[PDB]
Amino acid sequence: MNIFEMLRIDEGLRLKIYKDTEGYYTIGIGHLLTKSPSLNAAKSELDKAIGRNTNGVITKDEAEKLFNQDVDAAVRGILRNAKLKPVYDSLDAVRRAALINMVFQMGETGVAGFTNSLRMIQQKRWDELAVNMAKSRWYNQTPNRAKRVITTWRTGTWDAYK
Ligand SMILES: [Cl-]
Ligand SMILES: [Cl-]
Secondary structure (H helix, E strand, O other): HHHHHHHHHHHOEEEEEEEEOOEEEEEEHHHHHHHOOOOHHHHHHHHHHOOOOOOEEOOOHHHHHHHHHHHHHHHHHHHOOOOHHHHHHHOOHHHHHHHHHHHHHHHHHHHOOOOOHHHHHHHHHHHHHHHHHHHOHHHHHHHHHHHHHHHHHHHOOOOOHH
């Protein structure tokens, strides 16, 4: 088990443009295309991203490429963020994967804003953290996913993914 396998599980894989859980144009493996209501604006972003006229459709190899790029940006984002970086450095490997997962889904900004959880993470107060994270839109909107991630944080193992 690793970050790649983890996110593939949580995000699924789809070769056609689609609406995410928030109604956003997305494709491949959780790759957000646009927050805009327009399918054309979405098709346009996708062609720009892929470098070709796709027609709202990509191949497997193309989704994986976007995925690679996205995992990489998440990591680099974390390491560039003043609030995030130290958090990341204080963690074990499984738990660093839980942070990337969240960053992937909600962005640096979203994550950085979970201030109280951040302090707990650092103090390594596992159980409390799990309770705190549950008190969130994130958890209310995508419970099963958030539960997997929260267990990950709580236990430091990959059990939720097995
Ligand atoms: Cl892109
Ligand atoms: Cl869910």
